[PDB]
Symmetry: C5
Subunit: 164 residues, 5 copies
């Protein structure tokens, strides 16, 4: 049942990294689960676009010979893969305001530090870079030489949050 006919996943070019990555991951997981022979997914790729994207596909259809080239064309035309220094400045911009728990903040900061080139930064320097931008209410009790991985920091922050 790999006719790519019944799928409720869509895309319309909203120009943001998260929506594009969600769409690409959902398509590739669907192809891995239901079963496509890696050629029928090119003949039925036009059943998922709407609005501004369908005009783009009817424009640039004649430069797609495989599947990986089409997925690379989507990722290159709708995400310009931002350089190094703007990510660091955006990262140090925001502080952790009150009425915001640890889980949302740690999820957003770990989603931001994945657009750097891979293999440059291990876990310890990443946690040391994260630890400065936390509020005083947690930081009075969770001082260093006590955590080594993000799971322990999340656990102790959750205990200090739900305790009082």
């Amino acid at each position: 049942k790999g006719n790519f006919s019944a799928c409720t996943h869509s895309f319309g070019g909203t120009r943001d990294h998260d929506v594009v990555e969600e769409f690409i991951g959902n398509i590739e997981t669907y192809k891995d689960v239901e079963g496509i022979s890696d050629e029928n997914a090119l003949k039925g790729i036009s059943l998922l676009f709407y609005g501004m994207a369908s005009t783009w596909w009817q424009g640039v259809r004649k430069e797609a010979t495989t599947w990986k080239e089409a997925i690379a064309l989507i990722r290159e035309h709708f995400s310009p893969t931002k350089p190094a220094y703007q990510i660091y400045m955006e990262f140090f911009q925001n502080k952790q305001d009150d009425h915001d728990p640890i889980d949302t903040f740690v999820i957003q900061k770990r989603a931001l530090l994945a657009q750097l080139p891979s293999g440059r930064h291990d876990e310890e320097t990443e946690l040391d870079l994260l630890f400065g931008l936390l509020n005083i209410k947690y930081r009075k009790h969770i001082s260093r030489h006590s955590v080594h991985t993000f799971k322990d920091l999340l656990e102790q922050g959750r205990i200090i949050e739900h305790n009082n």
Copy 2:
């Protein structure tokens, strides 16, 4: 037909106990009814998240080796299983206002007294703890040494409600 492809049940991290319990129960009942071999449900778990949850899964995917560990990770990260005394204080907080029948109140108070540790409280002390927070209009006619289980209390309250 266990490809976990066609399912209209979703979750997006609303941070509440009831939505999480409803989602977990619906997934587990779907797996019991249609038929999954307990390994294909891990390869297709990513077809049910959207929004804030998909970034969380793309973050913490590498710490899930079975199915029960993933369901425990969901229940532990999105519900911090509140302690004993806050449930008792929240329970004695609200009184039963007028223009509210017995069924809604009894359903909410029985949904609240299930987050305690199991095996501490049987039925009689639970009904004796519930009986104080009822309005005078029912309580003038349904005096004690007449009911022993919640079905009889609901029945006599329904008769006194629909009679006049």
Copy 3:
């Protein structure tokens, strides 16, 4: 194909007779049409509730041993089957205002006179009880000893309506 997996019929406890009767009729017609072996419909009844009803089912699940007991539990907990005299008073309350045709009024009055105990009232006394609460515009031309069943009254009212 009786896995009770794909069905777009739902219920959430709106506390009204018509919604409950519509939901029960749609479920029972679905079971008669597609084919269930009268035991699989109990294992998959939890795929149709949402919101306030799912907490109610997780509360009272342990008092359902068959299918008819579960359908009776729904009908008894969400409809208190109103007594005799309130139906008669509600029935004589409303008059037929202008800018309202015969079909809507006759449908509502025949939907109200079905909650009485069966076998007490035949067709002739029911039409004689209905005939008093009609407007003067129809009643100047449709005088008695001319109709015996509701079809003839609807037919002559429709002719007098669409004629002028």
Copy 4:
């Protein structure tokens, strides 16, 4: 696959000719395409009504022995098939205002002149009756003894529209 289980076509009694005709045509085309043995469509007709129509069906279910009688009951109870002179007066009522092309006007006037009794009016008198109620901007250039069928009138009106 004729269980009349998966169909996204519905009806709720909006009291208009066009919605009823669309619903009847969609049901009959579905029965012609998928394959029903002309008896299973009566046992599953109750899976398509909602709201005010389901009470009507639970009222008048016991006067339907075949399929054509049920479709005639729908067409007779929800469309009173308007008489001759009101259609002619409604037809000559409206004129063709500016900022309205030929296609919409011709479609509406041909949809109105189908409720007359059939076999009374051929094509030539119908076009001669239509030609009076057109604006001066088209009528200065499309004078008679030049068109004989509606296709030619639509074609020359479209040329005069898109030319200037």
Copy 5:
């Protein structure tokens, strides 16, 4: 499975080129993917229209003997294929305002220059006609005798955009 029964693509006559072209492309790709024997698609074409289009089909049904004639009737009645000079004037009308990247503008201008008669204009004159209507911020750095195809212009514009 070519009964044209389950399809979530619809059309209602919005009178625009893009919606009509999207609808025609989606239908033809569906027929190429799932499998129709080129005669069953005419018996089930009426399961996709709604509103104003269904009255049009019930009007003009008797002038469709094949599939290509029906698709040509749709394209001719709902798109009047605009002449040459209005496309050129509309094309030179708009300039590229700030806070608008290169991809959206190039997609719209390449979607507009496809309604001309084919075989008149190759790639070089098209890029030379496009290059005049760009803002000064890109045009200070991307001067000519450096690009020959639209891919290189998009690439250098994307580098100059995401660099500063």
